[PDB]
Symmetry: D3
Subunit: 275 residues, 6 copies
């Protein structure tokens, strides 16, 4: 295993990635290209949550994929998230295509994963980067490669749907209301989505995931949805690894099955080797 | 996540380790010390099998533990595995104690994992390093730190018990017949052992694991044993990650549950945080 | 000790830092969080002077603090220093807060040090970043963390006060005269300043430092000031370490005591462990 | 030998370089400063061709020079190449001057190599960076150092001269027609050029290189030109190293002597040590 | 291109290597396995000469091969060169086999290159490692992989043949006289040898190379030999790259063609891709 | 500043070093060779004390020298300290000579610093490595380079002189009593020594330094000695940097002047640039 931390400069706003590369198993007689997952964590658009970075990447690497963590555009200075964060995703996928041979990446198996705020970028991107009208508007044109599916964990999907609370916090995120709500952007072009959330999510009401999934079916898009009964927002892995020390509310054994559900779903979709 | 690859020189035969350090999560308020697992892979004493190195490390690391892979003494040159391989383990545990504060290692939770030939070293060590008589005999004296438990996967336990096939290959492994068989070395002071193997193991006969568990019980040491019904030798993870490309015999979905079994077992022993 | 060199992208103009991290002492039974000093060297806004980077960092590291060298915005292309350089400082402090647990940084003990042209950035920042009005104007809002004190060595404080020599050179630094003079930016909210300069400073008139201290006191901010009697501009450490080879005019034994004065002043401020 | 990969932030558009530094020979009793070659590969302004990076840098390194590969501005997002790419070259040369002491670089011996699209940037730069009229217009002022010579392999010199085909592709490269054609930008100020191309270049008509040389003589700049008889576009080293697997058309043994011709030409100019 | 510097511990005397790995070209739609050359420099058995390390490795790398520099056993402390250096060579080849898949090494194309004292190790190894009686005697048994050919530049072949001078120097190198002379070790199992030397070699008489070739033929091993008319010992590349500053005697344009001769010879042996 | 961690294999027992290299100052017109200090920490021959590694290295680095920390042979396995540790010092000095050109090391200014147990190795080495009789006997022959002076801080000088307490502990350190006591090894060939200790040293009675200093004047070798009136063993820097958290007994302001005293002592010896 190798770890690469790096600035990519091929977008208007340069950004940092952290790639975790799988190494070839040395006593294999032949080579294998592995899938790769790009993770956009949460942190409410003002920071990148560590709980949703390495611990999630490591769990997915365990199942045999490369992973990359994208530090997408935050609110800092008077900066807005969009349209920049969308462009950084496109550049990250592009950059991956250039690294394929060196790292044995299966470019037909590029997965994006978003959590909370992170989910908005990915949900939007699955929307935006699947319609050339919105591609051009947002300058995702001229980037190589594309993603095969998305995974969304308790995603922000609609900025008027409870998060963020105050109007003045919507606006920081963006004064472009044409993507306050990722549900309205779904077309039959959108790539297959695995979605999960808790029903008891106070900070990001489940209608977000419902609305995306609802809209995912209404345009015939292969989608799976798990709304677990209990659990607070931001469970991450919902187990001791991502548990804030001494805070039981981060433990939820029912939600903790999601990575297994996710991986099995990726296999079904032909996007991960089956055993 | 950092990757450290390094020679340790505090043994008669210097040796390489590869450490994979967990990084602290930044959204945490307080620091956490994590367990560490040292892995001795298989390879029939002539090599170190990559199938049982990083893939296994990553899976254990996904559960929230540091891991280190130890290139124990092989048959190379007119060299024998023992007693050097034992000293290298002690040196590795020692080295961990000196890295504990920089990496947040919980030294009361140092776990050893052995696979196949690698299991002999760990099994022997579990015996030798808990008996001052054999400690001193084999030069493990003056090393800091101790391991809390072992994990053995399809472990070579007795060199007269099938592997190796010829008498000339077992000699190469060692002239010292006082540890051809680790099942004879087991005494009360030994640390708890989680053991698994398949029953249809041609290469390394199940009597090996049976004999060792027999002796852990006939000696009152907390233990656990899983002998799956089917499967060839060297399953590793028994899934697509460790599957030699196109070889179905490396898939066994029943055996594939062993890491979960092992993690839950560690949690029960209070050697890994629980859920 | 670890050396991290790195681009930070969380500002309008991305920029390089070079971080020098203290490692934990391994025979300490418990962990210690250390203070951190951010250094902005001189170079007359057209370069970053090496004499005021590592040699100064190492002397400060020897007293038990992390250090980071910041390559603030220079005059290059047709770029001005301001307001960008101010933002880069805010982002660096912010970045530090995110690295605190991994490196054991005491974020309550963040010190900024500026030299010559570098002092302007720091002196201005100390004023700007303690006033929401000037904060917001210059886009320092939304960044985490704050500095506890500043250190200024022969600082450029007023752009009309002799440096730079020509009209055409002032302007290249900035077409914003509301920052030509950091002495006018001084208000009571400011963090405490240790200031030193030589009286015979031909290149940057002592009126600069004198004006700043004059305003630190008139606004009741804790300040200490050493105006040494002899010596040219840019003494740095004023000894053989930073002495341009064969040039005695860089040696000044009286000025050479400043790091000691500064460290004791920091201890007095409760911003460094006392011995 | 050392390999440095890194972002430089001293341009409006930050960018990656990959520097390959020569190490001092240890049994030399005195040090030696080595020339350095900056390489801008081709890729038709939409990517950076690996065929024209490392394999070319390694060949030039074998003759005793440092090399740096410059990832100049491409067409990505709605971005055009110019004027940004010209600034990135200036910042790279500038950065080199700042590394000269640590790496023993002879700043009197900075050479630029451009291939295909990369050649346009180098050819244009050679024009722009020698005339302060076009210097100022394109924002190259305040950057230290200067190049002593260029090398152009099958360079794009004129955008209306066959490449790019469509008009829509012209424009993506630039809506500044003023430098669609580096031929008409040559003055006596220009640095000496070694130029080569094949006569049968379908993709980028030979008239391109012909025009630049024609212009290089008509304003009398020391120059040398090799238009080989056979060979497709993008030969690179024109041997097995840069040969696309199983594609004979990338082999051309007459063109393959170009690195020798170039090196001898550099020795002639006093830009490389001689034999 | 990546540079790996590392201790290998798989011999009685552990030892450092410096590997220079070629990176795959990202434009190639398929992958390519490259040959690899192990280089044993000279230094008269008391040091490793830098003139014969990187400079030579870089020239060979430019031709499209991986290279590794082996720091073989010297006369240091009280040690003799043999039989350890032979084991270190075997362990290095072995290590390469384990790196083959991660770096795309063609294990049927492993070439050994020795210079001066380094040449003795290579020449002897070519003999020893091609004879199981002498294989075993010297403990090269149990190591994987083997080399396809050797290259010898002004090699030490016989220790009584003028190098080393005094009796007391030969003995330091080794008291085992059975391989004072690599000519006698030659048998038809020996891999093919490209050999070169100058006839005016005062330091190491030409009869050395003469005798080895003289025996490669009389044992029907494919071999080529170039004895240049002029030139001192230790020409290395015989050009400005390996020339001691201000020392013309290191220049020799006739001998300087040797790397081209060797590469063509390798192509002829099907050991390097042809043009 | 660069940090190099590394195994050296040119001794019977390979060993780790950690080198801290000063970087050249970029705004110097000329280059400068700096002195280098090799540090052997204490730890009572069973471990290397972190209190006496980096913190001391950093403080010496601040004065403008390279530093290297040597992990000399410990009591581990059934291994003794001697004669191995002496060889390791020799190889380290030797290795430095091979790195001089690359790092600008002034090989005429190599200084050894030992603390407590580490002092014994340095003190003995000072004795052994200056007399060819003991040189040959202990196999320091054939290593290049030599040291100019030693620094000893509360050194163990005689193993009967209190430390270690029991006869069982001394013997572990070594059976060879011909260097239980470095005071008896002092002859006038020895390089100059700066020596310090506290009078109240319980664990290692002042007798040791006194006995060494006494013995050092009697062979007319330039020396300096400081015996502070208070303070326990192992003060290191005797300040807050090396203070065990909450343990005042590690603070001693009088002894804390020793680095300054030592540096000024090196200046008069002409082994460090003077200011
Ligand atoms: C225990 C050891 O080999 O020494 C060190 C010291 C600092 C960091 C890593 C290793
Ligand atoms: C820029 C940032 O905060 O991302 C990280 C996170 C952990 C380690 C290094 C960088
Ligand atoms: C054009 C280029 O060099 O792209 C990269 C970037 C990082 C690593 C390898 C290749
Ligand atoms: C010139 C500058 O300050 O950037 C650096 C810093 C350290 C090393 C290399 C480049
Ligand atoms: C002396 C040695 O082990 O080899 C080298 C040489 C140059 C740089 C690094 C290692």
């Amino acid at each position: 295993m190798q770890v690469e931390q790096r600035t990519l400069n091929t977008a208007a706003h340069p950004f940092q990635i952290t790639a975790y590369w799988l190494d070839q198993i040395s006593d294999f007689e032949t080579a294998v290209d592995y899938p790769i997952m790009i993770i956009c964590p949460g942190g409410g658009f003002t920071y990148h949550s560590g709980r949703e970075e390495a611990p999630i990447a490591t769990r997915m690497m365990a199942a045999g994929m490369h992973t990359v963590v994208l530090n997408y555009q935050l609110i800092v200075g008077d900066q807005s998230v969009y349209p920049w964060a969308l462009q950084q995703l496109g550049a990250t996928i592009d950059w991956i295509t250039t690294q394929a041979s060196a790292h044995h990446v299966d470019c037909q198996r590029i997965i994006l994963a978003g959590f909370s705020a992170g989910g908005h970028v990915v949900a939007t991107y699955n929307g935006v980067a699947t319609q050339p009208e919105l591609r051009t508007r947002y300058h995702l044109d001229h980037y190589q490669g594309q993603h095969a599916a998305i995974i969304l964990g308790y995603p922000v999907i609609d900025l008027t749907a409870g998060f963020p609370t105050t109007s003045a916090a919507r606006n920081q995120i963006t004064t472009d209301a044409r993507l306050w709500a990722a549900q309205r952007l779904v077309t039959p072009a959108s790539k297959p989505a695995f979605v999960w959330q808790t029903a008891t999510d106070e900070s990001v009401p489940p209608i977000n995931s419902l609305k995306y999934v609802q809209a995912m079916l209404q345009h015939q898009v292969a989608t799976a949805y798990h709304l677990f009964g209990s659990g607070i927002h931001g469970l991450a892995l919902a187990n001791h690894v991502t548990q804030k020390p001494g805070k039981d509310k981060y433990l939820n054994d029912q939600a903790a099955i999601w990575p297994q559900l996710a991986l099995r779903w990726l296999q079904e979709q032909g996007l991960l080797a089956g055993n």
